[PDB]
Amino acid sequence: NGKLIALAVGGAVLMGALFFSVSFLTGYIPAPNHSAILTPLRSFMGWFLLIFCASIIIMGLGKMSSAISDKWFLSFPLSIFVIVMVMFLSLRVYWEKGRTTTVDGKYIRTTAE
Amino acid sequence: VTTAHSDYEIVLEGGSSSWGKVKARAKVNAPPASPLLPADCDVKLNVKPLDPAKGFVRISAVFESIVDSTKNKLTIEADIANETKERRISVGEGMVSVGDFSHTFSFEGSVVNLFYYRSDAVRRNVPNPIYMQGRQFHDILMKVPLDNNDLIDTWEGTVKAIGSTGAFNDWIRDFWFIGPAFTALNEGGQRISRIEVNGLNTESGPKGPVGVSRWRFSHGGSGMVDSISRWAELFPSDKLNRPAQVEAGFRSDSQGIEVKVDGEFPGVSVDAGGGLRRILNHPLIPLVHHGMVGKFNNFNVDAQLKVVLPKGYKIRYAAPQYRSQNLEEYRWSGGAYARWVEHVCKGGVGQFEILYAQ
Amino acid sequence: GSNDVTTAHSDYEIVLEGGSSSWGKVKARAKVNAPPASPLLPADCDVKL
Amino acid sequence: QGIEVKVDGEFPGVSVDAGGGLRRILNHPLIPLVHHGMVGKFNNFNVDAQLK
Amino acid sequence: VVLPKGYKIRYAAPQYRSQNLEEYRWSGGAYARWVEHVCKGGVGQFEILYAQ
Amino acid sequence: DAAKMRRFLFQRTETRSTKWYQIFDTEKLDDEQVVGGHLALLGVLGFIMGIYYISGIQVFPWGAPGFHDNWFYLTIKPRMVSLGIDTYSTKTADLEAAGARLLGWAAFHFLVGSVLIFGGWRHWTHNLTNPFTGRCGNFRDFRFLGKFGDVVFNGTSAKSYKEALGPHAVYMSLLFLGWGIVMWAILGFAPIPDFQTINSETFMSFVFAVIFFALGIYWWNNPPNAAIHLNDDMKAAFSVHLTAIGYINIALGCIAFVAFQQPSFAPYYKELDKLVFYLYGEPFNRVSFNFVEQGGKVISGAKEFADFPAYAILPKSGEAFGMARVVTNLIVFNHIICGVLYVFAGVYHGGQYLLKIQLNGMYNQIKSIWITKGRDQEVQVKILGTVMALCFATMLSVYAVIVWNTICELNIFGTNITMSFYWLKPLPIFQWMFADPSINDWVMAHVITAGSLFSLIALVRIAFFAHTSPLWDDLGLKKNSYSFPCLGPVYGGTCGVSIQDQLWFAMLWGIKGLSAVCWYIDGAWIASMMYGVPAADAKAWDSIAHLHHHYTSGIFYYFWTETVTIFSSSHLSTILMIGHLVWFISFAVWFEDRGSRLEGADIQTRTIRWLGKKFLNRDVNFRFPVLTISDSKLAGTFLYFGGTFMLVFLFLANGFYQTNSPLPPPV
Amino acid sequence: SHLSTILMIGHLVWFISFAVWFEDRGSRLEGADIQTRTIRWLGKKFLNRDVNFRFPVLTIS
Amino acid sequence: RRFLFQRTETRSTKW
Ligand code: BCL
Ligand code: BCL
Ligand code: G2O
Ligand code: G2O
Ligand SMILES: CCCCCCCCCCCC(=O)OC[C@H]1O[C@H](OC(C)(C)CCC/C(C)=C/C=C/C(C)=C/C=C/C(C)=C/C=C/C=C(C)/C=C\C=C(C)\C=C\c2c(C)ccc(C)c2C)[C@H](O)[C@@H](O)[C@@H]1O
Ligand SMILES: CCCCCCCCCCCCCCCC(=O)OC[C@H](COP(=O)(O)OC[C@@H](O)CO)OC(=O)CCCCCCCCCCCCCCC
Ligand code: SF4
Ligand SMILES: [Ca+2]
């Protein structure tokens, strides 16, 4: 129903208020240039994203195994192909935006180093 | 597009029990073939034993409908029991209301179902007989109080018509089966014999005159007809032990059909023979009768059958085969099952047998 | 994705005879991927004339 | 190799009078004691009992 | 309790201590309690069901 | 004839069978046979203790080069230095005395073990006849020793096990007092209540002697009642005591780990780092391909070093090779794994007895709390479900923390080590039980909890679902063999539901939570899988988390570091190969392949029979037997568990390498 | 970093195969029924309404 | 007997 999504979020926000609350008790020295308000929150967000991504991968790959059929002749390979495309283009527009050059901008491609 | 969504759930009970939870949903985005729209209906059925010492069960059905802003209601209660292996007796009352008009009725009827043959060569060579030709002999005694002037008008017109024309016996079938019901009779193999009106007399009852009309008819079957070929199966009085309920009803308009039927009743699973249980062979009359009305639009079907067996109960010979399984929660979806669903929604008669046993 | 296709395959061959003769070799094979409208399945038949 | 007993009760006559507003728990019935006695003297036991 | 060749005790109560090939032993525990029970006057059941 | 074959594979079938590894099953053993077996095994234990003491000789005071160091004796050398029987002495003169003392103690152990073995043999044969007097003692009713056996235990030897606890406690008080007087007389060490010297051991031996004597008196005159363990003490009391000893042994491992690092234990363990150890199989003085003997000086093919003639075992320092904590970890992990195994075995044998009493209806006939609890079929479900939920929560949380730490190390998805769980330390109210408390110790506590609960799942399934389970209650089935591997592919498959297979799964699940100890006691930063690796930020842990030590490497990089020394030595390398070999062979019997093995063995039998006729002659009637899934699972659990813990030993015995110098950030 | 991540993922995926190759399918099924009863127990008198979902276990095939 | 072969078939409608 809706109480689950009020508890999956409710459980997650409990972790957000629990990891953030114990950071102020487990006395630690944070990173050289960092704030103690956000440095446990970032780790909690990464942890929750890990669990949530694993859960949604499991749910999605279980659902597109009961819903998959002979009618997925197209858009099963096309969805895989567009996923490949978006990964490859994120390899250029988001991750490693450019091909590595020096600080001046010169390209070194052979064994001249 | 006209996609037809539908989810069916069958939850059976084990041992000697034959009960089953049956809840089904349908969402068809197609125009219904109803000359009057919108046609919203609510159907509620109930039955409970009265005295199982001799078979009385109190079956009550309430039909509530609103067709073109016309609120229609039909409640009926009956005390039905199998007097004999081939004979059944019933008694009860009810009321019929349409808008402001409403006339109550009480009745007593006996239905005697005969099979044209009882050869045991068929019995010992056909493991799952389906087509069983026969004839039901309804003998109906019904009394209706005549309170409204419209009741007086109906009664007087009917008695004058019976006295006047000698073809009232066969021309009543034109009135009796309004609209496409007559065509449904022929496609289902049914044939209505000329009714034998044994007397239409009125007497001053408790508060006024009551129209008591004896009449009988004999409606036969070519084998497809459910009321004959499965006479002992459609009325599981012997294997009823608690109140059984079925709540159907559809909300329908000019651009869609929404169906939601619930269920609780025995006879969902019948012994296929020698300890092997099976889902009861599909009642053919509903399929063929939905046949003239399910063929008007081509539709994409995503039908999900979720048959939940009881614990320890395995399956064998699912055709079409179950698509996925969860150790009880067998599921039919897509592939050959959706094809069979389209086939039977367009009027098909193809077999889908589920032979299950522990 | 597409609608419910349910392809049906069939071939028919007719070979006639000349003159006043009216004979003909009829040869037909069919395959429908649809559930037959029989309440008892599977069904088979072998018709010889 | 044992006996487990549950008893739950709610009834009048649990207490009787003894004079001058002094009430007492009813005198213990004789028959149950001297009946369990002829069956409860077969194993040496060090029973630990708590009464409330 | 020396059973015949191939016979096996099912539901010895009090439970037997050590099964040895085809002969059984009772000693201490519930068997000693039952022996004291029947020596002092009890008629508690010690049935040894067995089949082959 | 297709039937002569049939009563050949109707010979390993997992019906009720002899099962050679159950010849000493407690069902066919009585109380006195148990006494005799334990006495004989304690005599053999004294024999092997004498053998270890002999292996501890370094000078052979009669005059000869002594024994090279070995783990069997290095794990007890700190104790013998504590008792004054061995020395950390740099000179031969004080080492000849240690050799003489070890030789004398080995001879004493040989004599005492021979006496103990003979007594256990006579108990085993029900032959308590005194050859000097010709009489015979009565096991059921015996005077213990004499007048002492009458002032206490006034005749009337214990007839039941709950009645035997008390005399046993008095016997253990006698053991404590005897060890105290052995200290005081033979080993010097007068009892002083100074809890920083071995004298405190004698003092507490006398204190525990008094405590055990009083407690034995009380339990002799007031025996306690667990009730049910009195009847089938062969399996009920035995299994309860086995799991109790398992918990005691885990506790003893923890005590050893804490104590051996304390300053009071410095002259026995920490001082092992000032020694040089010559271990069997370690890198020896290598020589070229053309060595022609003629000692005194090498002529052709000069060896690695002019010293250490021929093939001598090269020295290794106790400071680079952290022999102090190497021996500490060996002892601690030995006792911890033995405790975990004993807990699992106690649960399994208790489940065996419990299924035996469920099959004959004695299960409902138990009055003690310890079964009237779990005879509910819902409290069973609630308990197993809450254990599973707690295991899921703890394991998911700690594993996601570890995975996030590894991601932040490698900077996957463009993360950073400052996004890791470097701040997640134990509370200051919990920081007292760790040195350098960090995310590593938090992860260790949560991994211990998760692994313990994970194994507790199978332990609870043994305890509760020995005969039936709510699934198998809902189905029309029941478990009645404790060793049957399956009922078949019905319901999609029924593999491994018996308590034996649940024991195997508990062992496999505890492998993780137990090897997590090996990582910890070696300082191997289980808080992440890639620590100390120079990939993106894994070398920044020492600075981002302000570590004081510098642990070896992460969970995965632990197989790279400190394997530099396993590979460096021939003995550890061959142990690695043997352990891996034994381990992967367990796949041949855990993989659902037994019928394939049976079919192939039938084919091989027909081949050998045919190959024995086409080329050879005569009948070749021998046929290849295949281990059934019961035997296959037993052998596979042994192969798997041994294969992993022959190499956990290699992690433990290859050195510590957990230096106290936190390396600076990569910058 | 990339090769180390591939290493860890490959090792994880590889040893997960033991959960299904080992003769343990019935153990997983019994435990999954326990999971179903726990999730529906924890969702009925602590949450509300039926928890009809049941945990599936891969058959031996 | 052609039915028997279809009767005795494992579920071939897996994903
Ligand atoms: C429908 C096919 C046949 C037919 C077959 C039967 C069968 C079969 C029986 C009767 C029976 C009777 N029939 Mg007739 N009968 C038909 C046409 C008629 C007509 C008419 C004007 O057309 C009339 C007046 C009657 C009159 C009667 C009564 C004498 C009697 C029961 C009435 C009652 O309970 O109603 C109550 C009406 C309902 C409950 C409404 C729901 C009706 C549908 C058919 C029930 C569906 C059940 C559902 C699939 C399963 C849910 C069951 C849950 C457990 C509740 N029949 C048509 C021709 N008739 C019964 C008898 O024997 O009496 C002795 C009986 O068993
Ligand atoms: C067997 C069917 C049910 C029944 C169900 C309905 C339904 C449904 C409706 C009516 C409707 C009406 N009912 Mg009525 N009604 C029945 C019994 C009666 C009797 C009687 C003497 O028995 C009378 C006078 C009436 C009177 C009336 C009509 C005046 C009125 C509107 C016209 C029409 O549709 O008629 C319908 C006529 C019949 C269905 C039966 C008429 C019976 C005649 C008068 C006597 C029996 C003659 C003969 C022996 C039986 C022939 C078989 C039947 C025709 C099936 N009903 C029986 C109990 N009745 C309508 C309404 O309520 O609101 C518009 C309507 O839609
Ligand atoms: C160490 C690795 C393995 C083997 C060595 C081996 C040998 C073997 N296996 Mg195997 N096996 C696995 C490992 C090994 N399986 C794993 C990990 C799985 C899980 C996936 C597995 C699974 C199956 C299934 C399912 C089946 C078999 C069989 C089958 C037999 C084939 C008979 C043949 O042609 O001779 C081939 C036999 C040899 C070449 C043996 C020669 C010795 C050599 C020098 C290796 C030395 C052996 C060992 C390393 C030293 C220990 C000795 C001791 C003294 C210390 C044959 C005995 C089959 C049969 O039994 O019948 C056909 C069968 O059905 N398996
Ligand atoms: C990574 C490896 C493993 C688990 C994770 C695990 C989880 C698990 N196992 Mg397992 N298992 C083995 C490995 C793993 N067994 C091996 C190698 C063997 C062969 C020896 C094996 C064998 C048995 C038998 C025989 C039985 C079970 C069960 C049982 C359940 C118990 C319920 C519980 O404690 O919940 C605790 C469960 C968790 C904390 C799961 C969370 C974790 C993480 C954070 C999630 C990551 C999951 C995965 C690593 C990545 C997927 C993400 C995606 C994006 C790719 C429970 C789900 C039992 C049941 O089915 O129920 C009782 C049972 O009978 N096993
Ligand atoms: C992630 C692994 C996979 C889990 C998923 C199981 C599914 C396996 C079943 C296979 C079938 C499958 O999945 O595919 C088929 C179907 O899949 C989906 O259907 C469902 C399965 C019903 C949805 C999934 C459920 C949920 C939404 C998933 C997400 C739920 C997540 C995992 C929430 C759980 C979080 C955990 C439990 C953390 C809970 C931990 C609780 C806290 C930490 C307590 C400790 C703290 C307290 C004590 C104080 C601490 C303290 C302090 C402060 C100081 C000092 C001290 C000393 C102390 C101790 C589709 O919907 C359908 O379409 C599809 O057909
Ligand atoms: C001409 C046709 C070919 C004919 C010859 C072919 C057959 C020759 C095969 C001979 C060698 C077989 C190859 C190996 C066979 C192989 O690898 O498969 C494992 C094998 C099981 O094999 P099966 O019985 O299924 O089939 C093998 C068949 O070849 C005959 O049995 O045996 C074991 O389980 C080993 C465990 C024995 C019990 C030991 C338990 C552990 C004891 C302790 C050791 C560890 C210490 C603890 C550490 C954790
Ligand atoms: S795979 Fe093996 S262990 Fe599992 S059910 Fe089948 S025969 Fe039994
Ligand atoms: Ca180490």
mmCIF file with all atom_site columns, N, CA and C in Angstrom, chain F residues 385 410 412 461 469-471 474 479 491-493 495-496 502 589-590 592 633, chain G residues 1 5 11 14 18 20-27 30 33 35 37-38 59-60:
data_model
loop_
_atom_site.group_PDB
_atom_site.id
_atom_site.type_symbol
_atom_site.label_atom_id
_atom_site.label_alt_id
_atom_site.label_comp_id
_atom_site.label_asym_id
_atom_site.label_entity_id
_atom_site.label_seq_id
_atom_site.pdbx_PDB_ins_code
_atom_site.Cartn_x
_atom_site.Cartn_y
_atom_site.Cartn_z
_atom_site.occupancy
_atom_site.B_iso_or_equiv
_atom_site.pdbx_formal_charge
_atom_site.auth_seq_id
_atom_site.auth_comp_id
_atom_site.auth_asym_id
_atom_site.auth_atom_id
_atom_site.pdbx_PDB_model_num
ATOM 1   N N  . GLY F 1 385 ? 12.794 -16.156 12.763  1.00 0.00 ? 385 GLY F N  1
ATOM 2   C CA . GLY F 1 385 ? 12.543 -14.977 11.958  1.00 0.00 ? 385 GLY F CA 1
ATOM 3   C C  . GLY F 1 385 ? 13.205 -13.731 12.506  1.00 0.00 ? 385 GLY F C  1
ATOM 4   N N  . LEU F 1 410 ? 38.634 3.524   -4.038  1.00 0.00 ? 410 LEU F N  1
ATOM 5   C CA . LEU F 1 410 ? 38.904 3.479   -5.469  1.00 0.00 ? 410 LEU F CA 1
ATOM 6   C C  . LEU F 1 410 ? 38.335 4.674   -6.218  1.00 0.00 ? 410 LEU F C  1
ATOM 7   N N  . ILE F 1 412 ? 35.399 5.122   -7.230  1.00 0.00 ? 412 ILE F N  1
ATOM 8   C CA . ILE F 1 412 ? 34.416 4.709   -8.221  1.00 0.00 ? 412 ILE F CA 1
ATOM 9   C C  . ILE F 1 412 ? 33.235 5.672   -8.181  1.00 0.00 ? 412 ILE F C  1
ATOM 10  N N  . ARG F 1 461 ? 17.905 -23.571 13.226  1.00 0.00 ? 461 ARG F N  1
ATOM 11  C CA . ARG F 1 461 ? 17.223 -24.546 12.382  1.00 0.00 ? 461 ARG F CA 1
ATOM 12  C C  . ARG F 1 461 ? 17.531 -25.976 12.815  1.00 0.00 ? 461 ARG F C  1
ATOM 13  N N  . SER F 1 469 ? 9.460  -28.793 10.261  1.00 0.00 ? 469 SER F N  1
ATOM 14  C CA . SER F 1 469 ? 9.544  -27.350 10.111  1.00 0.00 ? 469 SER F CA 1
ATOM 15  C C  . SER F 1 469 ? 8.205  -26.838 9.613   1.00 0.00 ? 469 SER F C  1
ATOM 16  N N  . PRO F 1 470 ? 7.906  -25.553 9.826   1.00 0.00 ? 470 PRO F N  1
ATOM 17  C CA . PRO F 1 470 ? 6.615  -25.023 9.358   1.00 0.00 ? 470 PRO F CA 1
ATOM 18  C C  . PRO F 1 470 ? 6.403  -25.194 7.867   1.00 0.00 ? 470 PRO F C  1
ATOM 19  N N  . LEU F 1 471 ? 7.466  -25.126 7.063   1.00 0.00 ? 471 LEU F N  1
ATOM 20  C CA . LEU F 1 471 ? 7.343  -25.495 5.657   1.00 0.00 ? 471 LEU F CA 1
ATOM 21  C C  . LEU F 1 471 ? 6.975  -26.962 5.515   1.00 0.00 ? 471 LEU F C  1
ATOM 22  N N  . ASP F 1 474 ? 3.567  -27.667 6.761   1.00 0.00 ? 474 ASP F N  1
ATOM 23  C CA . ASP F 1 474 ? 2.570  -27.330 5.750   1.00 0.00 ? 474 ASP F CA 1
ATOM 24  C C  . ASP F 1 474 ? 2.541  -28.375 4.645   1.00 0.00 ? 474 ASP F C  1
ATOM 25  N N  . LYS F 1 479 ? 11.093 -34.911 8.826   1.00 0.00 ? 479 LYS F N  1
ATOM 26  C CA . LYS F 1 479 ? 12.491 -35.323 8.799   1.00 0.00 ? 479 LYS F CA 1
ATOM 27  C C  . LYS F 1 479 ? 12.724 -36.386 9.866   1.00 0.00 ? 479 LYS F C  1
ATOM 28  N N  . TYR F 1 491 ? 8.697  -30.227 -5.095  1.00 0.00 ? 491 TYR F N  1
ATOM 29  C CA . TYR F 1 491 ? 8.572  -28.851 -4.612  1.00 0.00 ? 491 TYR F CA 1
ATOM 30  C C  . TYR F 1 491 ? 9.753  -28.009 -5.081  1.00 0.00 ? 491 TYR F C  1
ATOM 31  N N  . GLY F 1 492 ? 10.293 -28.361 -6.243  1.00 0.00 ? 492 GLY F N  1
ATOM 32  C CA . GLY F 1 492 ? 11.445 -27.679 -6.780  1.00 0.00 ? 492 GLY F CA 1
ATOM 33  C C  . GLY F 1 492 ? 12.771 -28.108 -6.195  1.00 0.00 ? 492 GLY F C  1
ATOM 34  N N  . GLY F 1 493 ? 12.775 -29.044 -5.250  1.00 0.00 ? 493 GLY F N  1
ATOM 35  C CA . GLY F 1 493 ? 14.004 -29.478 -4.617  1.00 0.00 ? 493 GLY F CA 1
ATOM 36  C C  . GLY F 1 493 ? 13.991 -29.397 -3.105  1.00 0.00 ? 493 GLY F C  1
ATOM 37  N N  . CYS F 1 495 ? 16.939 -30.163 -1.062  1.00 0.00 ? 495 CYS F N  1
ATOM 38  C CA . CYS F 1 495 ? 18.327 -30.435 -0.714  1.00 0.00 ? 495 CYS F CA 1
ATOM 39  C C  . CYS F 1 495 ? 18.675 -29.885 0.662   1.00 0.00 ? 495 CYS F C  1
ATOM 40  N N  . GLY F 1 496 ? 19.446 -30.661 1.419   1.00 0.00 ? 496 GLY F N  1
ATOM 41  C CA . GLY F 1 496 ? 20.095 -30.160 2.615   1.00 0.00 ? 496 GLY F CA 1
ATOM 42  C C  . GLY F 1 496 ? 19.193 -29.611 3.701   1.00 0.00 ? 496 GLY F C  1
ATOM 43  N N  . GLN F 1 502 ? 22.341 -28.784 7.869   1.00 0.00 ? 502 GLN F N  1
ATOM 44  C CA . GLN F 1 502 ? 22.265 -27.489 8.536   1.00 0.00 ? 502 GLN F CA 1
ATOM 45  C C  . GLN F 1 502 ? 23.538 -27.208 9.325   1.00 0.00 ? 502 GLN F C  1
ATOM 46  N N  . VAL F 1 589 ? 31.673 -32.721 -4.620  1.00 0.00 ? 589 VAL F N  1
ATOM 47  C CA . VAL F 1 589 ? 30.713 -33.387 -3.751  1.00 0.00 ? 589 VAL F CA 1
ATOM 48  C C  . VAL F 1 589 ? 29.622 -32.462 -3.221  1.00 0.00 ? 589 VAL F C  1
ATOM 49  N N  . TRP F 1 590 ? 29.852 -31.149 -3.130  1.00 0.00 ? 590 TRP F N  1
ATOM 50  C CA . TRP F 1 590 ? 28.767 -30.197 -2.898  1.00 0.00 ? 590 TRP F CA 1
ATOM 51  C C  . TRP F 1 590 ? 27.950 -29.837 -4.124  1.00 0.00 ? 590 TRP F C  1
ATOM 52  N N  . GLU F 1 592 ? 25.558 -30.270 -7.110  1.00 0.00 ? 592 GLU F N  1
ATOM 53  C CA . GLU F 1 592 ? 24.488 -31.263 -7.178  1.00 0.00 ? 592 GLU F CA 1
ATOM 54  C C  . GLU F 1 592 ? 24.800 -32.193 -8.345  1.00 0.00 ? 592 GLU F C  1
ATOM 55  N N  . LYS F 1 633 ? 28.362 -34.731 1.347   1.00 0.00 ? 633 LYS F N  1
ATOM 56  C CA . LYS F 1 633 ? 28.325 -33.506 2.140   1.00 0.00 ? 633 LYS F CA 1
ATOM 57  C C  . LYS F 1 633 ? 29.282 -33.566 3.321   1.00 0.00 ? 633 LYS F C  1
ATOM 58  N N  . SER G 2 1   ? 41.839 1.406   -10.160 1.00 0.00 ? 1   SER G N  1
ATOM 59  C CA . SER G 2 1   ? 40.562 1.250   -9.473  1.00 0.00 ? 1   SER G CA 1
ATOM 60  C C  . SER G 2 1   ? 39.606 0.360   -10.256 1.00 0.00 ? 1   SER G C  1
ATOM 61  N N  . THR G 2 5   ? 37.880 -3.101  -8.982  1.00 0.00 ? 5   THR G N  1
ATOM 62  C CA . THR G 2 5   ? 36.431 -3.244  -8.901  1.00 0.00 ? 5   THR G CA 1
ATOM 63  C C  . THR G 2 5   ? 35.958 -4.471  -9.669  1.00 0.00 ? 5   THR G C  1
ATOM 64  N N  . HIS G 2 11  ? 34.815 -11.933 -8.079  1.00 0.00 ? 11  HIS G N  1
ATOM 65  C CA . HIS G 2 11  ? 34.891 -12.849 -6.945  1.00 0.00 ? 11  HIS G CA 1
ATOM 66  C C  . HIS G 2 11  ? 33.537 -12.989 -6.261  1.00 0.00 ? 11  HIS G C  1
ATOM 67  N N  . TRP G 2 14  ? 31.194 -14.996 -8.413  1.00 0.00 ? 14  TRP G N  1
ATOM 68  C CA . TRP G 2 14  ? 31.639 -16.381 -8.459  1.00 0.00 ? 14  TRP G CA 1
ATOM 69  C C  . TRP G 2 14  ? 31.232 -17.139 -7.205  1.00 0.00 ? 14  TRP G C  1
ATOM 70  N N  . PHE G 2 18  ? 27.869 -20.706 -5.137  1.00 0.00 ? 18  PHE G N  1
ATOM 71  C CA . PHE G 2 18  ? 27.808 -21.798 -4.171  1.00 0.00 ? 18  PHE G CA 1
ATOM 72  C C  . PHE G 2 18  ? 26.437 -21.892 -3.518  1.00 0.00 ? 18  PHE G C  1
ATOM 73  N N  . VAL G 2 20  ? 23.707 -21.892 -4.822  1.00 0.00 ? 20  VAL G N  1
ATOM 74  C CA . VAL G 2 20  ? 22.774 -22.625 -5.664  1.00 0.00 ? 20  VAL G CA 1
ATOM 75  C C  . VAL G 2 20  ? 23.350 -23.919 -6.224  1.00 0.00 ? 20  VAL G C  1
ATOM 76  N N  . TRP G 2 21  ? 24.668 -24.036 -6.398  1.00 0.00 ? 21  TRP G N  1
ATOM 77  C CA . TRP G 2 21  ? 25.234 -25.320 -6.800  1.00 0.00 ? 21  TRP G CA 1
ATOM 78  C C  . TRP G 2 21  ? 25.309 -26.322 -5.659  1.00 0.00 ? 21  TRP G C  1
ATOM 79  N N  . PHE G 2 22  ? 25.532 -25.860 -4.435  1.00 0.00 ? 22  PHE G N  1
ATOM 80  C CA . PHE G 2 22  ? 25.615 -26.773 -3.309  1.00 0.00 ? 22  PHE G CA 1
ATOM 81  C C  . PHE G 2 22  ? 24.273 -27.472 -3.116  1.00 0.00 ? 22  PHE G C  1
ATOM 82  N N  . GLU G 2 23  ? 24.309 -28.685 -2.561  1.00 0.00 ? 23  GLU G N  1
ATOM 83  C CA . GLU G 2 23  ? 23.053 -29.400 -2.341  1.00 0.00 ? 23  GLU G CA 1
ATOM 84  C C  . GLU G 2 23  ? 22.368 -28.711 -1.167  1.00 0.00 ? 23  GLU G C  1
ATOM 85  N N  . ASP G 2 24  ? 21.714 -27.587 -1.467  1.00 0.00 ? 24  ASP G N  1
ATOM 86  C CA . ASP G 2 24  ? 21.122 -26.770 -0.417  1.00 0.00 ? 24  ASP G CA 1
ATOM 87  C C  . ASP G 2 24  ? 19.774 -26.175 -0.802  1.00 0.00 ? 24  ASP G C  1
ATOM 88  N N  . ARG G 2 25  ? 19.175 -26.604 -1.917  1.00 0.00 ? 25  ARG G N  1
ATOM 89  C CA . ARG G 2 25  ? 17.952 -25.969 -2.397  1.00 0.00 ? 25  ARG G CA 1
ATOM 90  C C  . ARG G 2 25  ? 16.822 -26.089 -1.383  1.00 0.00 ? 25  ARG G C  1
ATOM 91  N N  . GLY G 2 26  ? 16.666 -27.263 -0.772  1.00 0.00 ? 26  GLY G N  1
ATOM 92  C CA . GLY G 2 26  ? 15.621 -27.428 0.224   1.00 0.00 ? 26  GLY G CA 1
ATOM 93  C C  . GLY G 2 26  ? 15.856 -26.586 1.460   1.00 0.00 ? 26  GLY G C  1
ATOM 94  N N  . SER G 2 27  ? 17.122 -26.420 1.848   1.00 0.00 ? 27  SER G N  1
ATOM 95  C CA . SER G 2 27  ? 17.432 -25.522 2.954   1.00 0.00 ? 27  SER G CA 1
ATOM 96  C C  . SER G 2 27  ? 17.029 -24.094 2.621   1.00 0.00 ? 27  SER G C  1
ATOM 97  N N  . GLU G 2 30  ? 13.139 -23.932 2.800   1.00 0.00 ? 30  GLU G N  1
ATOM 98  C CA . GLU G 2 30  ? 12.672 -23.875 4.180   1.00 0.00 ? 30  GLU G CA 1
ATOM 99  C C  . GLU G 2 30  ? 12.948 -22.507 4.790   1.00 0.00 ? 30  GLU G C  1
ATOM 100 N N  . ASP G 2 33  ? 10.550 -19.923 3.318   1.00 0.00 ? 33  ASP G N  1
ATOM 101 C CA . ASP G 2 33  ? 9.243  -19.968 3.964   1.00 0.00 ? 33  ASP G CA 1
ATOM 102 C C  . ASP G 2 33  ? 9.311  -19.292 5.328   1.00 0.00 ? 33  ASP G C  1
ATOM 103 N N  . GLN G 2 35  ? 11.287 -16.802 5.962   1.00 0.00 ? 35  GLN G N  1
ATOM 104 C CA . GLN G 2 35  ? 11.303 -15.381 5.615   1.00 0.00 ? 35  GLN G CA 1
ATOM 105 C C  . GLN G 2 35  ? 9.901  -14.872 5.324   1.00 0.00 ? 35  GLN G C  1
ATOM 106 N N  . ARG G 2 37  ? 7.010  -16.090 6.454   1.00 0.00 ? 37  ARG G N  1
ATOM 107 C CA . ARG G 2 37  ? 6.247  -16.020 7.695   1.00 0.00 ? 37  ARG G CA 1
ATOM 108 C C  . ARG G 2 37  ? 6.719  -14.869 8.573   1.00 0.00 ? 37  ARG G C  1
ATOM 109 N N  . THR G 2 38  ? 8.014  -14.551 8.530   1.00 0.00 ? 38  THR G N  1
ATOM 110 C CA . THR G 2 38  ? 8.522  -13.432 9.316   1.00 0.00 ? 38  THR G CA 1
ATOM 111 C C  . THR G 2 38  ? 8.055  -12.099 8.752   1.00 0.00 ? 38  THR G C  1
ATOM 112 N N  . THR G 2 59  ? 14.351 -23.262 -8.248  1.00 0.00 ? 59  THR G N  1
ATOM 113 C CA . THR G 2 59  ? 14.353 -24.714 -8.234  1.00 0.00 ? 59  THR G CA 1
ATOM 114 C C  . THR G 2 59  ? 15.750 -25.228 -8.578  1.00 0.00 ? 59  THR G C  1
ATOM 115 N N  . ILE G 2 60  ? 15.959 -26.532 -8.388  1.00 0.00 ? 60  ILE G N  1
ATOM 116 C CA . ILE G 2 60  ? 17.301 -27.080 -8.560  1.00 0.00 ? 60  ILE G CA 1
ATOM 117 C C  . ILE G 2 60  ? 17.780 -26.878 -9.992  1.00 0.00 ? 60  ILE G C  1
#
